[PDB]
Amino acid sequence: MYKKEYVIDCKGHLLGRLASLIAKELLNGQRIVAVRCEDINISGSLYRNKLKYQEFLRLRTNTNPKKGPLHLREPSKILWRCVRGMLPHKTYKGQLALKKLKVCVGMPYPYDKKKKYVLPSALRAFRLKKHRRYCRLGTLSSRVGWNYDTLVKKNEVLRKQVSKAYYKKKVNNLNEKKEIKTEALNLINPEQRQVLENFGY
C-alpha cells in the first residue's frame, strides 16, 4: 500500500480472497506481483472446479468464437482474470489498476531474489476447515489444457536448491555478525551499553 511494489507468494492462498485483496490494493494504487500462481488453492473438490471450468469453456459467441470470452488456461492468467472480474476494468482508472498487476507461474529472475509476502486473510490453512475439499490451481489448469505443470515443478526445485544455498550463507553471515556484536558490546561505554540493554538491543 505504501511500497514501490509488493511481491506476493500465492502458494496456499484461496483464489477469490487473494483476488479481492489484490484488487483492492491495485485500486488504491499499490503495484503487486503475484508469483507461484500455480499453487493457488480453490475451495471445493477438484472435480467440482473442473466442472465449473468446463461450464466456462462451453461459453463462446457462436457467431464468431474469436470475439468470444477468451478462456486462458495458465493459472497466472486465471488469477489475472479473477482480479479483473473484481475490478472496474472498463474505466480508465480501473484499467490502470489492472495493468498495475503482474502474475507469474513459478518465480522468474527478478522476483526470486526479493522478499515474498503472504496474506493471512486468504491462507487456506486459516480459511478452510481441515475436513473440507479443496483443489490446486495448477492441477486444475493441467486438466483443462495448460500442460506446463511439471516444467514449473522442476524449475521450482532448482530454485529451492539455490535458495537453500543462499540461506545457508546468510545464516553463517548472521551468526558471524551476532558474535561480532556481542564482542563489541563490551567495548562501548557502559552508559550506552545500559541504554541498549534496557531497550532490548
Binding site: 457467431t63 464468431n64 474469436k66 507461474v105 516444467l151 514449473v152 524449475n155
Partner: protein
C-alpha cells in the same frame, strides 16, 4: 424449425480460415516426439515437386482380391538434391514455450544460402554473413557448451541447393530440421560432425518408409462457394443466379455465423498430409534409377521430353506413392512420422 432433411455440413471447419498461406515454403508445425533410445538422426528434408508418373508393383496382400496380381499405382517425383547443414539452434523449455538459447553457424556459408537474406541481391554488395563467421573457436565452443547444458531441443539449420535444380529461383530455401535421438551431448556431436557438408535424402529416409508431406496447395484465386465448399447449385429458375448459398443464416442470431460458406480464396493453403510411402530413393549417380529387375533397361526417372512445367531431374529423387499438394517446382517438406 428443424431441417426437413439432415445432411452433413459442407467442408471442414478445421481448415479455417481459408486464407492464403503466409509463405510458399511448407513449415513443420510439430516435429516427431523425441525418443532418447534411438541414435541421433535428422527428422525432415526439403525437395521440389517435379511431376507424377505411374509404376507397376506386385501386391502381397493375402486375402485381397488383388494379391498375386500386378497393379498400377500413381506416384509423385520429388527432386531431392542434398541439403547443406549450415547452422545449429538450441531450444530450451520455458512456461512461455520454446526459447532459443543461441544459433551458431558454420565457418563458411554459400552464396545460395546468403541470397535468402536479400530482396535485391544483384545490386547489393552482399555483405551478409561476412564478418560474423570469423568468431573465435573458443566462443563457438562456449556457445555449444551452454547449448548442451541448458537446451533440450536441438535443430540443425539446413538449406536446399536450387542451382542443382531447373528452378529459376536462386536463393535457397532454409529450414530447421530437429535432431531426434540420444542425449544432448550426442545430438550436438552428431550435428557438429556434419556442420558444413551435404545431407542427402538417403541418410534421412529409408525406402518403403511412411512419411508426412507438408506443402502449399495449388492456388486458384477467389472461387465461388460452389467450388470452394461444394454447396449444391440452386435450380435453373433462380432469379439472381444459382451459384450461391440460398440462406446464410436464420433470423436469430442477428448476424452471419462463421460456419456459413462464402466466396473467397481457394487454394494456396498450407497442408500436412500423412502416410505417403517412399517407393524408391533414386540416386543421381546410377544411370538405371528408373529401371527395375523386371525391366533391366537403362533409363532415368525423367520422362522423355522432360517433366512438364518442371524440367529434368538430374539429382537425387524419391518416388512417393500417391499425390502431393502443390504445383510443379513447389518446395515440399518431407517429415518423419
Amino acid at each position: 424449425s428443424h431441417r426437413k432433411f439432415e445432411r452433413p455440413r459442407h467442408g471442414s471447419l478445421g481448415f479455417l480460415p481459408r486464407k492464403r498461406c503466409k509463405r510458399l515454403r511448407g513449415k513443420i508445425r510439430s516435429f516427431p516426439k523425441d525418443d532418447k533410445e534411438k541414435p541421433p538422426h535428422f527428422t525432415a528434408f526439403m525437395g521440389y515437386k517435379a511431376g507424377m508418373t505411374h509404376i507397376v508393383r506386385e501386391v502381397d496382400k493375402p486375402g485381397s482380391k488383388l494379391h498375386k496380381k500386378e497393379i498400377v499405382e500413381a506416384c509423385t517425383i520429388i527432386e531431392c538434391a542434398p541439403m547443406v547443414v549450415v547452422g545449429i539452434v538450441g531450444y530450451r523449455e520455458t512456461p512461455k514455450g520454446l526459447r532459443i538459447l543461441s544459433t551458431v553457424w558454420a565457418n563458411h556459408v554459400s552464396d545460395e544460402f546468403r541470397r535468402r537474406y536479400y530482396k535485391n541481391w544483384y545490386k547489393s554488395e552482399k555483405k551478409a554473413f561476412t564478418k560474423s563467421l570469423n568468431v573465435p573457436e573458443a566462443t563457438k565452443n562456449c556457445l555449444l557448451k551452454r547449448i548442451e547444458k541448458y537446451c533440450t531441443v536441438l535443430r540443425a539449420i539446413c538449406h536446399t541447393q536450387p542451382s542443382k535444380t531447373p528452378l529459376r529461383m536462386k536463393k535457397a530455401h532454409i529450414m530447421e530440421v530437429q535432431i531426434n535421438g540420444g542425449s544432448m551431448k550426442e545430438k550436438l556431436e552428431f550435428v557438429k560432425e556434419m556442420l558444413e557438408k551435404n545431407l542427402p535424402v538417403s541418410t534421412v529416409f529409408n525406402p518403403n518408409e511412411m512419411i508426412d508431406v507438408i506443402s502449399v496447395t495449388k492456388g486458384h484465386g477467389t472461387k465461388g462457394v460452389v467450388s470452394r465448399y461444394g454447396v449444391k447449385r440452386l435450380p435453373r429458375k433462380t432469379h439472381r443466379g444459382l451459384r450461391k448459398v440460398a440462406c446464410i443464416g436464420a433470423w436469430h442470431p442477428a448476424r452471419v455465423q462463421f460456419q456459413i460458406p462464402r466466396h473467397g480464396q481457394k487454394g494456396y493453403f498450407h497442408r500436412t498430409e500423412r502416410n505417403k510411402k517412399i517407393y524408391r530413393i533414386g540416386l543421381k549417380t546410377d544411370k538405371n534409377s528408373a529401371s527395375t529387375d523386371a525391366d533391366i533397361t537403362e533409363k532415368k526417372i525423367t520422362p522423355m521430353g522432360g517433366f512438364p512445367h518442371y524440367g529434368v531431374v538430374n539429382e537425387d529423387f524419391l518416388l512417393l506413392k500417391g499425390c502431393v499438394a502443390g504445383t510443379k517446382k513447389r518446395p515440399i517438406t518431407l517429415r518423419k512420422n
